[PDB]
Amino acid sequence: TRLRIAIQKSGRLSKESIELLSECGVKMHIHEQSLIAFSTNLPIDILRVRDDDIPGLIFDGVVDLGIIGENVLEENELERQSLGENPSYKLLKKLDFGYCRLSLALPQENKFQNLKDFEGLRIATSYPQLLKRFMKENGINYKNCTLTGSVEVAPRANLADAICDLVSSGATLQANNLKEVKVIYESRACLIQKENALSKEKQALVDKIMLRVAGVMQARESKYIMLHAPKEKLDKIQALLPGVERPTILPLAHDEKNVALHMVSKENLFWETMEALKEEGASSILVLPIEKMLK
Amino acid sequence: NTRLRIAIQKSGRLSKESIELLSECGVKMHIHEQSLIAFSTNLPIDILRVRDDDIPGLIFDGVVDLGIIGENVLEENELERQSLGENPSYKLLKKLDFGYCRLSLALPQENKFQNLKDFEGLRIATSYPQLLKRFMKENGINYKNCTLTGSVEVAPRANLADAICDLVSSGATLQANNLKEVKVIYESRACLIQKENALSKEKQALVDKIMLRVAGVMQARESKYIMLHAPKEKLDKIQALLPGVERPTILPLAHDEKNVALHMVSKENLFWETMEALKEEGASSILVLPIEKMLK
Amino acid sequence: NTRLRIAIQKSGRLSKESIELLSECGVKMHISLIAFSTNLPIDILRVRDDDIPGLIFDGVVDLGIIGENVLEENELERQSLGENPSYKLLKKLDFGYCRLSLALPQENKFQNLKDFEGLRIATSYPQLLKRFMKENGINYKNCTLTGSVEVAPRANLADAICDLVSSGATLQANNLKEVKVIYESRACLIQKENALSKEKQALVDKIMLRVAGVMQARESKYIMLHAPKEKLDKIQALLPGVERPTILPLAHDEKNVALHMVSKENLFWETMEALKEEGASSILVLPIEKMLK
Amino acid sequence: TRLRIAIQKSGRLSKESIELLSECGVKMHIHEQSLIAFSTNLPIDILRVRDDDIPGLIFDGVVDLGIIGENVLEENELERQSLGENPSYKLLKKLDFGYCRLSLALPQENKFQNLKDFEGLRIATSYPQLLKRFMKENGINYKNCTLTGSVEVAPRANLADAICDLVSSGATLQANNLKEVKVIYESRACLIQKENALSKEKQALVDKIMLRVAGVMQARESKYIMLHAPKEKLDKIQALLPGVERPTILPLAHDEKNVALHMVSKENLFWETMEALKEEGASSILVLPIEKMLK
Amino acid sequence: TRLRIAIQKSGRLSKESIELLSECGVKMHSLIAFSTNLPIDILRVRDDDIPGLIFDGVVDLGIIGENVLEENELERQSLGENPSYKLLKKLDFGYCRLSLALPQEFQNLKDFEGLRIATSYPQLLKRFMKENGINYKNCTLTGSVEVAPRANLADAICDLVSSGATLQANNLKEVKVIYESRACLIQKENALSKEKQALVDKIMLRVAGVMQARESKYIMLHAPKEKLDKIQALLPGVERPTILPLAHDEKNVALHMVSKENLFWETMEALKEEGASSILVLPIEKMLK
Amino acid sequence: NTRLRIAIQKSGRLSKESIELLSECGVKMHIHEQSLIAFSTNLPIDILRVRDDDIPGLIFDGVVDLGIIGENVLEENELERQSLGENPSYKLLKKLDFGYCRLSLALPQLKDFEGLRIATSYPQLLKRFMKENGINYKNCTLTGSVEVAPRANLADAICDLVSSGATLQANNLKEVKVIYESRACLIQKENALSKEKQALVDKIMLRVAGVMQARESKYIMLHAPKEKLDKIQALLPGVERPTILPLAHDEKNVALHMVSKENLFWETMEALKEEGASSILVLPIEKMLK
Ligand SMILES: Nc1ncnc2c1ncn2[C@@H]1O[C@H](COP(=O)(O)O)[C@@H](O)[C@H]1O
Ligand SMILES: Nc1ncnc2c1ncn2[C@@H]1O[C@H](COP(=O)(O)O)[C@@H](O)[C@H]1O
Ligand SMILES: Nc1ncnc2c1ncn2[C@@H]1O[C@H](COP(=O)(O)O)[C@@H](O)[C@H]1O
Ligand SMILES: Nc1ncnc2c1ncn2[C@@H]1O[C@H](COP(=O)(O)O)[C@@H](O)[C@H]1O
Ligand SMILES: Nc1ncnc2c1ncn2[C@@H]1O[C@H](COP(=O)(O)O)[C@@H](O)[C@H]1O
Ligand SMILES: Nc1ncnc2c1ncn2[C@@H]1O[C@H](COP(=O)(O)O)[C@@H](O)[C@H]1O
Ligand SMILES: N[C@@H](Cc1c[nH]c[nH+]1)C(=O)O
Ligand SMILES: N[C@@H](Cc1c[nH]c[nH+]1)C(=O)O
Ligand SMILES: N[C@@H](Cc1c[nH]c[nH+]1)C(=O)O
Ligand SMILES: N[C@@H](Cc1c[nH]c[nH+]1)C(=O)O
Ligand SMILES: N[C@@H](Cc1c[nH]c[nH+]1)C(=O)O
Ligand SMILES: N[C@@H](Cc1c[nH]c[nH+]1)C(=O)O
Ligand SMILES: [Mg+2]
Ligand SMILES: [Mg+2]
Numbered sequence A, D: 001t002r003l004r005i006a007i008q009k010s011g012r013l014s015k016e017s018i019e020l021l022s023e024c025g026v027k028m029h030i031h032e033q034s035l036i037a038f039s040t041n042l043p044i045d046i047l048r049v050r051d052d053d054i055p056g057l058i059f060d061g062v063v064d065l066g067i068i069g070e071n072v073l074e075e076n077e078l079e080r081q082s083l084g085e086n087p088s089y090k091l092l093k094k095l096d097f098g099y100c101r102l103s104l105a106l107p108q109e110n111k112f113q114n115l116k117d118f119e120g121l122r123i124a125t126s127y128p129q130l131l132k133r134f135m136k137e138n139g140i141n142y143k144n145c146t147l148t149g150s151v152e153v154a155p156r157a158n159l160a161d162a163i164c165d166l167v168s169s170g171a172t173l174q175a176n177n178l179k180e181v182k183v184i185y186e187s188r189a190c191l192i193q194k195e196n197a198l199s200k201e202k203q204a205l206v207d208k209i210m211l212r213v214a215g216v217m218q219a220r221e222s223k224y225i226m227l228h229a230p231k232e233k234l235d236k237i238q239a240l241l242p243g244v245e246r247p248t249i250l251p252l253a254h255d256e257k258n259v260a261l262h263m264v265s266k267e268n269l270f271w272e273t274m275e276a277l278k279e280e281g282a283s284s285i286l287v288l289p290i291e292k293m294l295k
Numbered sequence B: 001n002t003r004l005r006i007a008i009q010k011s012g013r014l015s016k017e018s019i020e021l022l023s024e025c026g027v028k029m030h031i032h033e034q035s036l037i038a039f040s041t042n043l044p045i046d047i048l049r050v051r052d053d054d055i056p057g058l059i060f061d062g063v064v065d066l067g068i069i070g071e072n073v074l075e076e077n078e079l080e081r082q083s084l085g086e087n088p089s090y091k092l093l094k095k096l097d098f099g100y101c102r103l104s105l106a107l108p109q110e111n112k113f114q115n116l117k118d119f120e121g122l123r124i125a126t127s128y129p130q131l132l133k134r135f136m137k138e139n140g141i142n143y144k145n146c147t148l149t150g151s152v153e154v155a156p157r158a159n160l161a162d163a164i165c166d167l168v169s170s171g172a173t174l175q176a177n178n179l180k181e182v183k184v185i186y187e188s189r190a191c192l193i194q195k196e197n198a199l200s201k202e203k204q205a206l207v208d209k210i211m212l213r214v215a216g217v218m219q220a221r222e223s224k225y226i227m228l229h230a231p232k233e234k235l236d237k238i239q240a241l242l243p244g245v246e247r248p249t250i251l252p253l254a255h256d257e258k259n260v261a262l263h264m265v266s267k268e269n270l271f272w273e274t275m276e277a278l279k280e281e282g283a284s285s286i287l288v289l290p291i292e293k294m295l296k
Numbered sequence C: 001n002t003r004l005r006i007a008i009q010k011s012g013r014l015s016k017e018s019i020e021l022l023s024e025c026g027v028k029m030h031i032s033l034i035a036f037s038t039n040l041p042i043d044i045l046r047v048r049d050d051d052i053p054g055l056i057f058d059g060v061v062d063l064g065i066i067g068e069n070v071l072e073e074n075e076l077e078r079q080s081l082g083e084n085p086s087y088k089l090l091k092k093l094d095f096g097y098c099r100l101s102l103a104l105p106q107e108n109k110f111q112n113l114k115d116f117e118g119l120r121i122a123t124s125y126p127q128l129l130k131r132f133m134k135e136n137g138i139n140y141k142n143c144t145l146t147g148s149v150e151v152a153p154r155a156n157l158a159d160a161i162c163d164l165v166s167s168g169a170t171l172q173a174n175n176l177k178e179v180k181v182i183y184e185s186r187a188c189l190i191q192k193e194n195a196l197s198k199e200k201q202a203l204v205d206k207i208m209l210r211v212a213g214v215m216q217a218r219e220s221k222y223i224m225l226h227a228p229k230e231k232l233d234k235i236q237a238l239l240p241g242v243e244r245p246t247i248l249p250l251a252h253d254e255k256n257v258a259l260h261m262v263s264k265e266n267l268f269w270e271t272m273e274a275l276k277e278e279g280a281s282s283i284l285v286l287p288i289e290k291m292l293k
Numbered sequence E: 001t002r003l004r005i006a007i008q009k010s011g012r013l014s015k016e017s018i019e020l021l022s023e024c025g026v027k028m029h030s031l032i033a034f035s036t037n038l039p040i041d042i043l044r045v046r047d048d049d050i051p052g053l054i055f056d057g058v059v060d061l062g063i064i065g066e067n068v069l070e071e072n073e074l075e076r077q078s079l080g081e082n083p084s085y086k087l088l089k090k091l092d093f094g095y096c097r098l099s100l101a102l103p104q105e106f107q108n109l110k111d112f113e114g115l116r117i118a119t120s121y122p123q124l125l126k127r128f129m130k131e132n133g134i135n136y137k138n139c140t141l142t143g144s145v146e147v148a149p150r151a152n153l154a155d156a157i158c159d160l161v162s163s164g165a166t167l168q169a170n171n172l173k174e175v176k177v178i179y180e181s182r183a184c185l186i187q188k189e190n191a192l193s194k195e196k197q198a199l200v201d202k203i204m205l206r207v208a209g210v211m212q213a214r215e216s217k218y219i220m221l222h223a224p225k226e227k228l229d230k231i232q233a234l235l236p237g238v239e240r241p242t243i244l245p246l247a248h249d250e251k252n253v254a255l256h257m258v259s260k261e262n263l264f265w266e267t268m269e270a271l272k273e274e275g276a277s278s279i280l281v282l283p284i285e286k287m288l289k
Numbered sequence F: 001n002t003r004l005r006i007a008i009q010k011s012g013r014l015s016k017e018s019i020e021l022l023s024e025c026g027v028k029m030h031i032h033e034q035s036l037i038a039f040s041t042n043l044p045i046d047i048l049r050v051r052d053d054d055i056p057g058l059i060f061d062g063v064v065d066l067g068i069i070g071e072n073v074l075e076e077n078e079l080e081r082q083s084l085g086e087n088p089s090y091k092l093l094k095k096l097d098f099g100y101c102r103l104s105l106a107l108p109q110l111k112d113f114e115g116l117r118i119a120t121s122y123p124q125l126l127k128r129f130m131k132e133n134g135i136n137y138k139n140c141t142l143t144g145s146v147e148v149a150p151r152a153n154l155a156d157a158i159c160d161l162v163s164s165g166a167t168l169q170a171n172n173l174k175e176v177k178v179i180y181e182s183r184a185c186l187i188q189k190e191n192a193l194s195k196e197k198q199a200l201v202d203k204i205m206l207r208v209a210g211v212m213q214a215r216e217s218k219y220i221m222l223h224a225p226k227e228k229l230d231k232i233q234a235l236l237p238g239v240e241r242p243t244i245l246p247l248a249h250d251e252k253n254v255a256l257h258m259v260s261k262e263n264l265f266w267e268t269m270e271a272l273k274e275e276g277a278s279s280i281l282v283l284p285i286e287k288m289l290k
């Protein structure tokens, strides 16, 4: 009937998923406890489910789309493969949020020279397949300890000698006196689709959503810069701030000496050149938002 | 009262949107979660947070100046007062662009519905007994009313009633309770209302100022400022696809005699519907920027 | 410390605005009492407001965002113990506005500051209150309360209070009248006295350019409209821009142009009807996130 | 079917209702969100509903029992009567909790105030029917202002000159600079039953529950007191602490001079006589709970 | 080191576990808690992780549902392991049934043939369906299993039921019970130190005391001496009634008897018929045979 | 000032235990989460909920009558007031049986504190201890989350409250030296109360004593052979001596009842069974008086 999208029930990843859908024009009036939501303007249903359950729903084709971390997706792919299955899906887009590293970590006091220091250790993780593959590949024997949450407390708790867990800022490792020693997997959120072909109408909607997703991602760190400069300085200013193609050049009232120039720029690059712009005579410099860009 | 007084809902999505609207209209305020009276820090305005069902009566009695409330709640209370022999009045200033919902009759999915006569003699649970009563009496359907203040959707399962009359936006709550929406009896959105009795000249002048801004906000809702590059020779075709609110702005590009920038205001969904055709006609570097207010 | 360290308030509206300011200055973070920026070498320490000045005075954090009132209260406390606290003021910011004021029950008669003579006065800012009363030669009994100061008169803890006021709602809620303002405050960005490394100072400099950009754009919008060419001078007189209007051609139109001007938003609304009288149409108000001279 | 009991969804009254049912042998697990609960040991369903909705459900006979404040019950009775209905119900028991006074209150002035001070005032209340009846009965004209909550803020908000609202401790009135001037109604929680006769099996269960309710209520504020005293002091001690019938008298090991005495007592009465008990030679005085008492 | 007890992080089972430990004399006030009066550490962990910690011997004791224990036992066995533990006590809380359920509107188990069935307990479901020769498609969901049919994620579910309210709220009918569970207290297989085992033994005496007292009360009443035998026949006590003199009274006595509370209420009117008065019901916190 | 005024903590386990104690002493009240002044509904008593650190000063200045507060907070504030030249005083009514904690010096996992920056919320208590032991240090006053200071590089060490030790362990800190031990106490302002207020305090205090004397005691009942009375009495003596009660139609066995500390009971329970005890019951005691 309607296109079905599975998203995470909780975490920063869930909030960013809802925001992405909203920016892609999916209106939804969603109670905190509602597990199935129905878009009010598009034929789309949103299913809020535990992250670890999303890959299996996509593998089995009972939802159409999913937003999920690569780590969770591959963990579950490996699990299904280990049982003799052949899970498949389509990767539509690697997204610009949910960034993390799956890393081996040890108490700060422990001595680490190389990977062989994990030989024979109990290692606590929520990703036992990803860990198993890596340790097999490197020929390191270890004892697995599967924990669903609070993995960082396992060494202190004496449930394990070490951990393999997700790191973003590194604050959680530090708070628990752990040192990140080896990155085994890098992940971000991705948008995936079931393998079996959709109806023409559903696929057409996916295509429309994907155009907007690309628009959002393209605009993400970019702003629309406006400024005034002497006409004679056009070339110097263009060399510093080129725009996505070339500056727009706009007349100013009763002024034949100066113009307004407009350029799209990544914001951090703008700030890195702002003083040189002033040195070349730029004034009244404005930074405006861009919600979507299509190049 | 020295200062203009505005009543808004204490809770719900409607309350958050009311606060946001006031903020976009230049009313600075800090509403702590507990604070029931807030004072604007930049304008002579007091904001009273009150239960939605109480707001119409405060306006009818003239003890607040303005109110933001759902049409459904307003009319439910208007009907209640009229049933008691009163003549409530107010001024409708603006139908707003949030708080959308339908008040609908709904039945368990298993129940057979052919027409309105299937509600004959049923117990119907609702929080809007006056709106329901009017509709059923207009259609000559007898029924037994069951007033419930909340969780109306659970009444059939709970065996408190055979059916319900409740607000629907997405339909998720009906589906979650195995209910089918059968007949819409009322459609509602948030509105801004004013008491009947004339305000002082200074208060009315402030209302007038606020209303100019409210119109600006509402006219901009769902519109964006589109910018793009195109070959000069394509201007007529691109203008046909994306006309702007009057006509495209045409802007030169540095050291380029072949291409220009074109800027147009567009409803966002119309923009997306024509975006591929724009690319087919040579458009590139297409940007979508927000518009906060628009005056035609 | 390898990384630049910034102390911000753990709670309050001031805390949320501090986080937003840092975000608008390009500091990505997911905020936990210590947070690590994911894109810049910056650590954010969330601490009780009253503790921030001391950390800056002692040089164990590099930057702090704190109310002027809290900063001066702690400066006075340290000075009273014989110390010489110092810091660098980087910027007076545009949020956290409040007044520290003497207030009395509405029934109490107030003619002069002398009406506080001999009263018990409850406050969370005993140093600021002490200085003011000493300066005005008013004797009083201090009552230090850490929170809910507004309830002290009703609770019979004190005859009066000295507390922060923003909207005045809390005083009204408690049947109190604001009688005398003793200190006005807003948030400020401060730095420790001892010189930073060249790399840290360079980062602070970068952040400060952005802070100025944010503050200069506050309340300004980018206005666009259409008008007859012959009306340019009248419209420019009403809405001049930050320098002068941008003037743009319209498709297949030789009579009308688009005009764009930066304007403070309230000034815009005050001239909008005159703009329409002079033939302006399709008037748009767009946001500006930063503005630089 | 099963016996159906409506209780309040929130408030101290809701917690006390659940506790009473538990002490009457009704086992149930009410999840925070669950609106219908099913007792696991008895054929009883518990419906959690807004207080103001309970009377109507009892009047219409669609639940069997209800626990509700007298004030809410009578307010709704008057409202239904005003619409031409004939609500009825059976009062089973006036309960031990939910005590409050519905009172007229005015902003504090430094001057005695009284009932006649309400002539012509706007009075805010959530109980317009109870207020109306009282004012009519006392021939006081006034203007009604119905507010569903936070009635205490109405004078400060300038929505009314005065209020009629519930008072328990008086703290809320004092916090809002209001003076309680006239009590118009006194209320406690009640257990009520629908008018139409229940099935024999349902009525038999109600009868069982009611025996227990009486047991609980009868025991409230009573304790089982035990003490040692010289045999010669029996009569003096019995005069001070008589028991519900007469003291139990128990031998002590290898002691012909002293006995243990046990007496049920209201706890406050116990504390009021405790020093006189010691003066008469009582020692090792214990206060034990009593969960139910039957005459 | 200190005795280590793993308990659930959340759920009613978690609260009852804490309560039981408190009634057994363990004072405590966080994912690792340290008892303030005994050498005991309490680890709060997700229920599904507890069995593995016991199997591997890295905690000493655990309080966990039988269902979760057996689910994990089966999982480990399916991987070729030989998990073991000691069952110390089947406890008196955490009751639930793991049941197959279907949308309201089933003749027999063959109606599940070929269905997609959503569950959080795939090993328990798999074993049952294999044993009954029913083919099905598994759908593993970690939570909110009851929404799967409505969400079109599965045709049916296999989930825990206590009161049945959740099934009814989702228009589901409980059709077949496949496993019944309560909380149990378990211990790792490898022997503890003498000191740790001695503490476990102490705790277990108290656990028995708590369980034996559950639903029993201490009944006291007055009756005419001549009615002793009739009253004893109705309310016998755990051994025989205590008989106590009343002040200056040769005609009546107090009688005290332990009774299950529901049995007491069932005979209370007959007690009054036989002349009982001033009947009191007092709590009992522990009882030992 | 018509009614007796009692200040209690606004939050913390101490706050809950304070409310529970008052309730067990017969003070009925409904403290809404927000309410800062509560009025007892059955006694002329007002309860003021205030931040712990503010309570001592209110008692010192005599503007509330009674307070329940940790000894640590009381003494910290006493020292602060003394350092300013004041002579704070109060009456200690009772050391209570909750709020137990240790104020301890702790380091990342005593002479080694020389010259360290030490973070604390109790700078007066720390100062006194370090002066007394002749250790120089740099004070860092933090109002909360003191345990994070070393990791945050705000200090080298801390002086903070410990109950279970979990918070120190969670932050990789080792408790090295206890400087102060504390529990909740009930205190009264120095200046004499009215006769009516003092009489109410006296009544409350009789009940407080009852509660505290019963804490950890239970009423034990059991059956035993008459011939075993002396052996059982030796194991479980009661607070004075066992109550001895006949059993229906039984000349050989009796019921015996004894008050016992609960842990002592459990320590002797197996010996009781060895001596023929059966049907052993443990009942609660809510108050006990000498
Ligand atoms: N993408 C993610 N999905 C799930 N957990 C995450 C993710 N990124 C970080 N975490 C966890 O979130 C917490 C914050 O990470 P950090 O910022 O490194 O302190 C840690 O417990 C991480 O293991
Ligand atoms: N404007 C509104 N005011 C009050 N409740 C509403 C409103 N719109 C929707 N609801 C409630 O939200 C739920 C319906 O939302 P939905 O599930 O999206 O149809 C029902 O519980 C409605 O009573
Ligand atoms: N900048 C500030 N910092 C801390 N507290 C504040 C600040 N501004 C206002 N308050 C407090 O916040 C409450 C609301 O202020 P008002 O808007 O005056 O009711 C009062 O308790 C004030 O004392
Ligand atoms: N039985 C009751 N039902 C509903 N509200 C109550 C009841 N008793 C007291 N209240 C309200 O609860 C708050 C506390 O009352 P008080 O103890 O008088 O401050 C006030 O807002 C009262 O109006
Ligand atoms: N021992 C348990 N462990 C986990 N979940 C449970 C347990 N017992 C009941 N539940 C869940 O709690 C909810 C309430 O059950 P019920 O009382 O049948 O509505 C349902 O989602 C059950 O699946
Ligand atoms: N009486 C008390 N007053 C204030 N804080 C306390 C008290 N007892 C313990 N704490 C704090 O409560 C937390 C828990 O203590 P612990 O049980 O040792 O982890 C720690 O942050 C202690 O500093
Ligand atoms: N011409 C500018 C800005 C712009 C892009 N698209 C439309 N205008 C650039 O190339 O960056
Ligand atoms: N000229 C364009 C853009 C614009 C509107 N207003 C100012 N500029 C349009 O009519 O849409
Ligand atoms: N030229 C207009 C708009 C503008 C500012 N900067 C760039 N463009 C003004 O001076 O306000
Ligand atoms: N005989 C005592 C205690 C008691 C009552 N019932 C049983 N025992 C009394 O009359 O109060
Ligand atoms: N003798 C009573 C009460 C009792 C049990 N244990 C001690 N006393 C009974 O057998 O039930
Ligand atoms: N006689 C017993 C029980 C008891 C105390 N007080 C009254 N009875 C004892 O001395 O412990
Ligand atoms: Mg999994
Ligand atoms: Mg109404």
Ligand SMILES: [Mg+2]
Pocket: C050
């Ligand atoms: Mg300070």
Ligand SMILES: [Mg+2]
Pocket: C147, C148, C149
């Ligand atoms: Mg405050």
Ligand SMILES: [Mg+2]
Pocket: C217, C218, C219, C220, C221, C287, C288, C289
């Ligand atoms: Mg702006």
Ligand SMILES: [Mg+2]
Pocket: D052
């Ligand atoms: Mg009603």
Ligand SMILES: [Mg+2]
Pocket: D149, D150, D151
């Ligand atoms: Mg209220």
Ligand SMILES: [Mg+2]
Pocket: E048
């Ligand atoms: Mg598992």
Ligand SMILES: [Mg+2]
Pocket: F053
């Ligand atoms: Mg202090």
